[PDB]
Design an enzyme around this catalytic site. Structure first.
Site, PDB file in Angstrom:
ATOM      1  N   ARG B 100       0.770  -1.231   0.000  1.00  0.00           N
ATOM      2  CA  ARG B 100       0.000   0.000   0.000  1.00  0.00           C
ATOM      3  C   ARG B 100       0.804   1.285   0.000  1.00  0.00           C
ATOM      4  O   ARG B 100       0.425   2.206  -0.742  1.00  0.00           O
ATOM      5  CB  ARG B 100      -1.055   0.126   1.079  1.00  0.00           C
ATOM      6  CG  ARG B 100      -1.822   1.396   0.682  1.00  0.00           C
ATOM      7  CD  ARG B 100      -2.987   1.705   1.458  1.00  0.00           C
ATOM      8  NE  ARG B 100      -3.666   2.897   0.956  1.00  0.00           N
ATOM      9  CZ  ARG B 100      -3.035   3.903   0.364  1.00  0.00           C
ATOM     10  NH1 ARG B 100      -1.713   3.887   0.156  1.00  0.00           N
ATOM     11  NH2 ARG B 100      -3.722   4.973   0.053  1.00  0.00           N
ATOM     12  N   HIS B 105       3.711   5.306  -5.989  1.00  0.00           N
ATOM     13  CA  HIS B 105       4.773   5.285  -7.034  1.00  0.00           C
ATOM     14  C   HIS B 105       4.274   4.607  -8.296  1.00  0.00           C
ATOM     15  O   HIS B 105       4.983   4.499  -9.292  1.00  0.00           O
ATOM     16  CB  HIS B 105       6.027   4.566  -6.535  1.00  0.00           C
ATOM     17  CG  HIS B 105       6.643   5.243  -5.369  1.00  0.00           C
ATOM     18  ND1 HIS B 105       6.206   6.475  -4.933  1.00  0.00           N
ATOM     19  CD2 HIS B 105       7.596   4.847  -4.498  1.00  0.00           C
ATOM     20  CE1 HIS B 105       6.865   6.808  -3.837  1.00  0.00           C
ATOM     21  NE2 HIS B 105       7.715   5.836  -3.550  1.00  0.00           N
TER      22      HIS B 105
END
EC number: 3.1.-.-
Lengths: 135, 135
Positions: B100, B105
């Site tokens: 998570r 990213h």
């Protein structure tokens, strides 16, 4: 780096485009539609979060010092970003942060609709922001 | 409110099913393919968060004379949940959080594929939790 925000801006833009093509979008099963909305909310988050960081970085490169704001407030980041002409309307961004802070509530479809409705505007400012940053 | 966890889960699952339809997914335009993976990742974040909110409310209402379970961080919640046989392996939920914490990213396509590939297992575990909570 700035390339990354740039790649992420386009992917978001491209995504709204496909969803915009109302002919192809309404044809698709409902689960395909709601997944694209969610993927668009996720891509919104990236540009928003990448934008702040690039914005914070330009700010730090142009300031009298990084000690001041970089450990200081959102609003202060905005005003300052406004001063150097990085953005045109800190009210759009105060709104954007409000938006981002609730994307975690997006499993609720209405709430998802509400965030998606604001994305087209979103693309405008961030577009401006990034133009500024290119220079 | 168990309904939300249930419906977010099922909506994720259904997202994964369309994505696995290789014949259908291989045909879609490039931006549709990744917006869909972007979306499935967003949906993974919803179940994760909700799954943890439920373990929390479960322990918070369960034996607790509502002892402001604030003193409790991630790992206490996982430990208690195990004490209640709500999950069965916490090394996995610990890993679901590391997952998570890198979804921000996910604007990098490779990092996004890597997280998506982990969704199948997430579905098994997350579905077990929902099983115990069903009782």
């Amino acid at each position: 780096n700035l390339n990354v925000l740039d790649a992420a801006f386009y992917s978001l833009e491209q995504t709204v485009v496909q969803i915009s093509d109302r002919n192809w979008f309404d044809m698709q099963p409902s689960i395909v539609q709601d997944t694209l909305i969610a993927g668009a909310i996720q891509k919104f988050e990236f540009v928003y979060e990448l934008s702040l960081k690039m914005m914070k970085r330009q700010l730090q490169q142009d300031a009298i010092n990084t000690d001041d704001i970089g450990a200081y407030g959102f609003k202060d980041i905005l005003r300052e970003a406004l001063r150097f002409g990085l953005i045109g309307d800190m009210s759009k961004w105060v709104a954007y942060r409000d938006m981002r802070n609730i994307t975690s509530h997006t499993y609720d479809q209405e709430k998802a609709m509400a965030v998606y409705a604001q994305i087209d505007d979103f693309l405008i400012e961030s577009s401006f922001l990034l133009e500024q940053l290119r220079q």
